Each structure stands twice: as structure tokens, then as C-alpha cells.
Amino acid sequence: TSVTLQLDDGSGRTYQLREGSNIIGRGQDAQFRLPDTGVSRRHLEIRWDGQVALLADLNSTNGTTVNNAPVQEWQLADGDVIRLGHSEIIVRMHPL
Template identity: 35%
Template structure:
């Protein structure tokens, strides 16, 4: 833990433009992951309320000696780095405008122990990202495809939940394409948002809704992530 964190702190000084750092020894996979994380953090941008869009395409350039040594790892190396980056993105609540892509190349002008990381610009893609609301509960995710989605224990609700603590049609989520409103529909036991009873309230992403004995989590996800 300390070794990785110290390494990442050293990397932060070099994320302006193309990343370049000389090491005294051969490049290790963990150093590639840390370099991309730093570049990801530097390129992340808030595009809508609490949603943060990070670059999704990275090119890592190594010295010819380091590239030749790591090349036999092939896709296993890329998959391991991706796994670490996706965990980092989840922790930071980053979202991507497309699939996470990592390419590793050799660059003859780099010396042993040097690497460069470049990230694709997402500025032109930001306006193309479509956001979709969803509810997570019971280990499943339910996409909210309508401008107004009702939740309750009765079949007349858009999302029927087997919970006797819920009213027949307990609450609704109203979505205008960019923001959501939580609305209690005169339920018997009330609807709580972040632990407080509400009648009608703006619904931020990742908020917890308590109704009956069920806890719902409201999500706002990039449309390309729905089938990921």
C-alpha cells in the first residue's frame, strides 16, 4: 500500500501533457497502472451535476527494452491493468464515454525505465453522452425508461416490488433527461430520502430511497454502460 501510494505521489508531478518519467530500473506493470491512473485523474471533468467523465483511451509508450520484456505478457497485462483502472474509476465515481482501451507500444527515443502515457481527448464526446436513470435494489438494476416511473407493491405500478410495507403505488421518479424528482404518492408509511421523510424532492445520483422494508439506490449511468 505505502509503496504504491508513494509511487503515485511522485507521478502526480508529471501529468501535465504527455506523461514522462525516468526510473532507475525496469518498468513494472504496477507502474503502468499508476501512470494511467494519474493521467485519468488529470483528464477527468465534471459534465453534469455529480457525474464525472474521464478519458477512456490510453496509449502507453515504453522503451524498446521494457516493451520487449513485457510483450510476452500480452493481453494478460492489459487485462490486469484494466481491472485496476476500473476499480479506481469506480472508487472515484468516474464514467467513460466508451469502452476502456489501453494500447502498449515501443518508442525508440525512450530509455530503459521511461514511459509516456497519452489519453484521448473526450471534449468532442461529452455532448454525445446520453444519461439513463435506474434503480438498484434486491441485487438487480431496473432501467427507468419513462419520464415518470411509479414503484409499489401493486401490479399497477411500473415497478412492482414484493414488500408488504409498500403502498400499492408508493412513490414515483420523474426524469426530464438530465435530472430527477422523487415524489411520494400519499403512501401509508412514507418515503425517505437519505433517511428523511420527503413529499417531493430533487433526487441526486447515488441517493438511497427507503420505502417499506426496501432500500432503493437511484443511479444515473452513461447509456453505453447499460449493456456493459
């Protein structure tokens, strides 16, 4: 299975998940950096093990929603919409 995050801001920016920890946030150390000033420096983590993508909010200032519902941890699926700050990320999860 391959998993790509698609930033839905017009930029066409994407990030393919690595196995293990993927940090999304505004910080320089994030694997996928969003400059959105409402995004925490370490905002969320997605753990990928080749089968399951498990999102966790990292005690973020503004929270994380999946498909418009606030979440702490969430098992992601193809097409899920993650909202953080004013940004939206579409999950693209496709079996080979």
C-alpha cells in the same frame, strides 16, 4: 444521462427509468414492483425528463425517505438511498 434503480435486497433486481412517469410500488400496474408488504401499491413516482429525476411520495401509507430524511418531493442524485417499507433502492445516475 441514464438512471437505474437498484434494489438493495440481495436480489440484484434493477429498473431503468423511462422518460415521463415511473411508478414504484407493490401494485401490479407499477413499473417496478416490490412485494414488500409495507410498500404501498402506488408508493412513489419518479418523473424523468432526461436531465432531472424528481421523486414524489404518492400519499403512501408508510412514507418515503431519501438518505434517511422523510420527503414529499425530492430531486434525486447519483447514490441517493430511497427507503420505502423495509426496502432500499440505490439511485444510479450517470452521464454518458
